[PDB]
Amino acid sequence: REVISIHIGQAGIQVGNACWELYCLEHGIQPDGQMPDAFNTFFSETGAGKHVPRCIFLDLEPTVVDEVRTGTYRQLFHPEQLISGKEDAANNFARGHYTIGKEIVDLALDRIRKLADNCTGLQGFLVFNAVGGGTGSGLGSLLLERLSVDYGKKSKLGFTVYPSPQVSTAVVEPYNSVLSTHSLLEHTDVAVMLDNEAIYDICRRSLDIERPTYTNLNRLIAQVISSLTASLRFDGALNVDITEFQTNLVPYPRIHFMLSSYAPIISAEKAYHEQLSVAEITNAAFEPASMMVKCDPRHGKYMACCLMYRGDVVPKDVNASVATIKTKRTIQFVDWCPTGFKCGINYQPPTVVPGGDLAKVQRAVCMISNSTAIGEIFSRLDHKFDLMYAKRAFVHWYVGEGMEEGEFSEAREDLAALEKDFEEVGA
Amino acid sequence: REVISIHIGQAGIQVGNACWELYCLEHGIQPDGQMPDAFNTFFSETGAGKHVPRCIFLDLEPTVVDEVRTGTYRQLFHPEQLISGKEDAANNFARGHYTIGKEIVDLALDRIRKLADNCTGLQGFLVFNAVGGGTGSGLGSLLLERLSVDYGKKSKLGFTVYPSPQVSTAVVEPYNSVLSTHSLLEHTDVAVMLDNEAIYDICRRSLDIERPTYTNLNRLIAQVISSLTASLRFDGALNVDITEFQTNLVPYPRIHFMLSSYAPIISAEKAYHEQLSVAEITNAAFEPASMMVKCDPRHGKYMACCLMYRGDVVPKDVNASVATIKTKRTIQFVDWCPTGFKCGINYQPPTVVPGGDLAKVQRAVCMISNSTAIGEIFSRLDHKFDLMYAKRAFVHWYVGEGMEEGEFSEAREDLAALEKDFEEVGA
Amino acid sequence: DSELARWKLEQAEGVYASAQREPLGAGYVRGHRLPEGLGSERPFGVTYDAR
Amino acid sequence: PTPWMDHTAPTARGRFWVGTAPHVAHDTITHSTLRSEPLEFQQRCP
Amino acid sequence: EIADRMYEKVKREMEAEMARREEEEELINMLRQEELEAKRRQEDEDRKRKA
Amino acid sequence: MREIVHIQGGQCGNQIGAKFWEVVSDEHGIDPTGTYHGDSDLQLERINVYFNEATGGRYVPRAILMDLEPGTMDSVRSGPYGQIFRPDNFVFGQTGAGNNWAKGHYTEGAELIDSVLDVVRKEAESCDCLQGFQVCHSLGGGTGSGMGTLLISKIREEYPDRMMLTFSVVPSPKVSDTVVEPYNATLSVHQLVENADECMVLDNEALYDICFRTLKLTTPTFGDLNHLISAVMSGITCCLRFPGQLNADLRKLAVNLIPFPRLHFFMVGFTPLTSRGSQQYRALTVPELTQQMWDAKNMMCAADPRHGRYLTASALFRGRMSTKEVDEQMLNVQNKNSSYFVEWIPNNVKSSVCDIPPKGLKMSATFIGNSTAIQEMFKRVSEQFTAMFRRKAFLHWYTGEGMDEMEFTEAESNMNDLVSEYQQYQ
Ligand SMILES: Nc1nc2c(ncn2[C@@H]2O[C@H](COP(=O)(O)OP(=O)(O)OP(=O)(O)O)[C@@H](O)[C@H]2O)c(=O)[nH]1
Ligand SMILES: Nc1nc2c(ncn2[C@@H]2O[C@H](COP(=O)(O)OP(=O)(O)OP(=O)(O)O)[C@@H](O)[C@H]2O)c(=O)[nH]1
Ligand SMILES: Nc1nc2c(ncn2[C@@H]2O[C@H](COP(=O)(O)OP(=O)(O)O)[C@@H](O)[C@H]2O)c(=O)[nH]1
Ligand SMILES: [Mg+2]
Numbered sequence A, B: 001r002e003v004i005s006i007h008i009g010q011a012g013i014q015v016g017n018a019c020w021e022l023y024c025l026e027h028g029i030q031p032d033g034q035m036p037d038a039f040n041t042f043f044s045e046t047g048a049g050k051h052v053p054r055c056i057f058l059d060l061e062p063t064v065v066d067e068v069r070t071g072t073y074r075q076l077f078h079p080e081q082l083i084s085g086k087e088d089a090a091n092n093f094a095r096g097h098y099t100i101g102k103e104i105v106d107l108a109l110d111r112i113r114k115l116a117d118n119c120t121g122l123q124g125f126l127v128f129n130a131v132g133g134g135t136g137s138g139l140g141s142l143l144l145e146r147l148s149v150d151y152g153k154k155s156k157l158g159f160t161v162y163p164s165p166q167v168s169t170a171v172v173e174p175y176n177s178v179l180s181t182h183s184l185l186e187h188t189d190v191a192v193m194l195d196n197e198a199i200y201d202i203c204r205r206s207l208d209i210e211r212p213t214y215t216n217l218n219r220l221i222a223q224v225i226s227s228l229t230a231s232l233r234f235d236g237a238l239n240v241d242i243t244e245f246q247t248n249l250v251p252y253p254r255i256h257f258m259l260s261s262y263a264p265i266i267s268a269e270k271a272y273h274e275q276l277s278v279a280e281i282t283n284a285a286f287e288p289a290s291m292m293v294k295c296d297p298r299h300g301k302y303m304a305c306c307l308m309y310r311g312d313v314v315p316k317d318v319n320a321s322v323a324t325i326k327t328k329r330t331i332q333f334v335d336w337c338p339t340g341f342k343c344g345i346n347y348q349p350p351t352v353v354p355g356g357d358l359a360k361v362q363r364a365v366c367m368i369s370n371s372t373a374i375g376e377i378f379s380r381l382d383h384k385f386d387l388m389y390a391k392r393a394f395v396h397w398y399v400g401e402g403m404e405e406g407e408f409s410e411a412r413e414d415l416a417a418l419e420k421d422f423e424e425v426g427a
Numbered sequence C: 001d002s003e004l005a006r007w008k009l010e011q012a013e014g015v016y017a018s019a020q021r022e023p024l025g026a027g028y029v030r031g032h033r034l035p036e037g038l039g040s041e042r043p044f045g046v047t048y049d050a051r
Numbered sequence D: 001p002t003p004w005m006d007h008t009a010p011t012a013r014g015r016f017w018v019g020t021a022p023h024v025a026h027d028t029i030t031h032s033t034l035r036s037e038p039l040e041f042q043q044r045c046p
Numbered sequence E: 001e002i003a004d005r006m007y008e009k010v011k012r013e014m015e016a017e018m019a020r021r022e023e024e025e026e027l028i029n030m031l032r033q034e035e036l037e038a039k040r041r042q043e044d045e046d047r048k049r050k051a
Numbered sequence F: 001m002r003e004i005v006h007i008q009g010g011q012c013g014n015q016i017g018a019k020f021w022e023v024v025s026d027e028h029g030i031d032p033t034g035t036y037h038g039d040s041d042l043q044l045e046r047i048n049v050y051f052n053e054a055t056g057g058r059y060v061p062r063a064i065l066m067d068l069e070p071g072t073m074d075s076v077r078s079g080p081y082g083q084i085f086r087p088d089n090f091v092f093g094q095t096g097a098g099n100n101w102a103k104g105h106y107t108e109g110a111e112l113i114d115s116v117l118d119v120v121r122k123e124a125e126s127c128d129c130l131q132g133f134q135v136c137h138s139l140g141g142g143t144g145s146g147m148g149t150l151l152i153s154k155i156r157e158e159y160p161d162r163m164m165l166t167f168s169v170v171p172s173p174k175v176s177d178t179v180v181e182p183y184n185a186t187l188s189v190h191q192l193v194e195n196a197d198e199c200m201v202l203d204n205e206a207l208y209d210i211c212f213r214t215l216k217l218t219t220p221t222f223g224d225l226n227h228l229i230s231a232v233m234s235g236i237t238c239c240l241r242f243p244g245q246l247n248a249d250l251r252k253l254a255v256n257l258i259p260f261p262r263l264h265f266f267m268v269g270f271t272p273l274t275s276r277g278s279q280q281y282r283a284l285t286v287p288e289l290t291q292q293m294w295d296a297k298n299m300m301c302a303a304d305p306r307h308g309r310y311l312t313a314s315a316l317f318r319g320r321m322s323t324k325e326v327d328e329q330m331l332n333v334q335n336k337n338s339s340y341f342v343e344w345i346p347n348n349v350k351s352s353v354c355d356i357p358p359k360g361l362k363m364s365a366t367f368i369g370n371s372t373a374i375q376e377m378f379k380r381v382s383e384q385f386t387a388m389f390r391r392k393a394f395l396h397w398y399t400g401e402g403m404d405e406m407e408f409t410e411a412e413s414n415m416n417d418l419v420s421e422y423q424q425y426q
């Protein structure tokens, strides 16, 4: 049971760069790369006593990549695996998908090939990218397309970072987002949205860190990814692998967009006071005050929910709490799924990172659900796309690169078709 | 069996600052939070060696709240449980009911929700407020209203602080009092009046403290509260829970306004000299010189009475004493009931606080009756509300906040209707 | 531009309230005393064994 | 310790999925098998 | 005997409160004394000025 | 948290504020260098109300000095606690209005107000949640009254939901500095009654009377008068800066004192004030402070309050006091002299306690009375205004600048019907 993780863009490689710090800490690997079976899903033992990760950071601008190449984890990552171009796509989907991808994707994929050939029981892929940028959006889509034509049958977990409604750092990210989804629909099997404002409000409210840099965000996102793969890495009382989300969370081949949530995100002082039990963290995983996407699930209806439990959890009280949730009437399910849940329990508790702000708690919950609020989000991005496109603003950069108006109109109607699908499914 | 206590306003959390000091000394809990099952109704035991109260202090100005955050009880109260707005309601009902409540009441209710879900055998709520101010009256009524919507059937003990007739500190308290009652009628189940002038008289006469501050007042108010929950906390010969006042003291759904009293309020030198027994304290709890509300029940006729007994008391002599009260003719009962009492006996004597002016007393009485003198108090306040509203004084403040004259007129007639109800039932 | 002066500036302005309430990465500390064991050796929350 | 030398653990001296430095120099296979020590590379892996 | 131990605790806490009140009132009177002597110095320097 | 922005206009305003920031800084224990050196930790908690953190323990006040002549600025930087203001807050003209309300409202304002508005707007959004503004100025001078008055109008236009204090001195004929006093005071008052939330009326005549009788001072320079007004302003905002057993901020004091939206001219007093000789021959009790509060020779206006009625009144106490004595003292003074109070409002007295006394005293008090004796002073001014306007004396230095005649008629009518309605409620 082995899974490889590729990182596309400047956001993706900063996230996984927090992830791999978490992984080496969870498996007791000092950053030089040697130990002082459970690891084998990430680190492949090779060379001399070296556990080198199954991962490739790939990006066009060398600033952040060589930053990694000089950082603390110089000796961890295989040198060949960090692919770095010479010049950026510069927040331009056409530039990342047609100009520069055409030289970079073949090298990326035929690395991927020899990583998969070293692999034996490959479970699937998982990608890290933010669709607002240029490289993570453009050549990411090109990479997923050629990976799908390479394997197809293997499940691909896409942990994307969408732009927030009001807090935003670019101008053309509506164009990048729309063009990124148009391929994320028919290539990714399971795609998890995580914007930045939701994490901002979490870090402000629960973790009471008020000037949060990007690491605090990346740190707790790494906690979420580690939490939903701990079932593969460690034996639990009730384990679920990466193929389960494929079956149990995707009721229709085009409705695959999953809100994430985590609990308890609690500091050291708030831990010494709250009593940490199972019923209240199950409650805490359901209010929009602890979701990783700024959306209102009260306006939506759930399709299917999944609950990962880590640490000291017995099946009795998780069944009890889930009973309480289903008997509450504040939140509601669709008329299709009376069995709207899927629980999972693992033994190993979540670990602490020194310098991080999360205390060592006995247990934790990672909720991954499916709803119609995501359908509200896509319409929100669709409106602000149409406004800028009505004046043909910024279009000349894409046309100058080599793209045209055809795919703009057809990607627009594709999101309109997705909207009509969500409105048809919700009824 | 658990009961949670919320404190609203400047006077509310100062009462709490004395109540929790009393509870911790009762259950032997140091202010740092750990002892060096009787506590289970007030403190939930998190983790290992730590009890955290079932309370929420709330206010709009942060001055008194962070005085608590920096006082001696920093570790005892959960950091999140203390709730503080940004700016005060400023003696303004409309401001504290429509302008700032709309921001604070959601956070308060979504906090008490998770306190209740932590709880298991919730008996009810008990609220602490003063209606003369702005914060206590306005969002106190707003909070009570939405609590009645959320739970409804659970009992709510309201220990309010009404303004005295002649000794008073504010100016617009008649407007705030009337407007607070108008919702205190149909929201509270059991409402207990506490006036400051009568407590000043008690401290002057019995405790012989000629210069009393607010600390002493809140100290013996905490004594009263502790005395009527001691039945829930400890087992006695004849115990009585929180649901019994609901039945045994409220003959009609809109007549619930109970006088309170306490005996013996005795200093350190008057104990080691008076010979204390049950007959004399049962007497002394009935004189107007020892009531907590400045009114003359000689003018009124009792509807019902409740007698809490703490300490060394047997059921025989308390029965003989209540017989002497029933056969005396200086006080009279209403014909609408021949059985006008409800006794209650608990074993543990009332504890003494360091620096407190009361002495170690063997046995004590807490009387909670219901009469028509309260109907006299409301008319007395109604007079001076008419005086100021006849000249349209101070109205522009409330109208500026967004209200009108309709609620003034209808609150005025609601108090007149209530006046009709007392003079009718007194017949 | 020196480690010393750079550190003395912060040692001086540590008296500020915002300097204690907005530690760029740390978060608000509250200065609460813990019972010496909940940080490192024992984890927070109630404990009933499953294993 | 240094990067230029191998970082191998003392138990996984010589194995198939792992090795970059010679376990033992100048030891013949037939020599070792006659000494009856089990062939290091044949040890299994998960 | 539990009763005896309790009233012993009461007496202990009584003495503690007395000591705290005494030290506080002393600090207050000291602040007053310093402000008074400052006033006196301001009073004397003006007379020096007029001379 | 709750924030107060300070604004000082004119020479009087500047020197009043100089003594004010001296006293407040001495209360919070911050040295004239600008660094904390106090003793108690109660002082650190509420200094954001009056200061901002600059660099290495540097707390700069949240004030804006404003005038039209450099001499006042030099006198500001000369004294101690003059190196603590931010020099960018020294927004400052160059020509000088000079006892001409038209100059201070149309000629020089048209180019100084844009810059003072920029600095006050930057200082307003610099904090999170404003409590209100606090303006110390005069009603006789030109660059103080006129310029400050338009600034009040601009601020109330931009920030209508924030409170607003104006410590304004009024001219009196016994101590009368300039000649156009009623021409400036009348117009400024006409604008205050529709713009300001409430005003604390002061005057130099009553202050000289206080320093003569009670203080028994020989040479009452402006330092002590500004020292008394500063002690008053510290007393009025003590409730924000220090915890208490009964808190009362600016807004609740306003809602307790103002029954009608045009009745917001208060007279102020301060307690205790005793001479150095008789300073130790007295006791410190709540009755002792109350008899000095309600004394008529202790009000800081030239308006004997016993010549009329009180509408409302407030008393802010500082020190470890017994609230029962506080309430019964207020009840005794109300029940004894029942004619001095209005009948259709019961319990005309609002009270508040704070546990931190001013430095040097054990227990102090501040009285704020909204009486109807103020119409005496306003009639005292308006009768001088009609005497001059009857034959247009001094009128052309205003007329030739943009001001016209209907403005003076309007100020007459607004002053006249205001004192009519004060008389009506009397
Ligand atoms: N969560 C998270 N998001 C990040 C981080 N850094 C950048 N982003 C997001 O990345 C988005 C823009 O894409 P980038 O990753 O910055 O750059 P890119 O995707 O490589 O595209 P190019 O700039 O053209 O190379 C922004 O909207 C950011 O929100 C990070 O550290 N954490
Ligand atoms: N018995 C008692 N009453 C108090 C105490 N503190 C304040 N009060 C009463 O509270 C009333 C005024 O309301 P406050 O509690 O002071 O303030 P508030 O209720 O929060 O209303 P706002 O001031 O607008 O915030 C006064 O009539 C006092 O009698 C106290 O410690 N004990
Ligand atoms: N209390 C006090 N009053 C002052 C002071 N300086 C001037 N005044 C009063 O202010 C009035 C003149 O105001 P002025 O300073 O000319 O105002 P400006 O010209 O607008 O700056 C006179 O009646 C003085 O009584 C001072 O330092 N203290
Ligand atoms: Mg980039």
Ligand SMILES: [Mg+2]
Residues within 6 Å of the ligand: B009, B010, B011, B133, B134, B135, B136
């Ligand atoms: Mg209050």
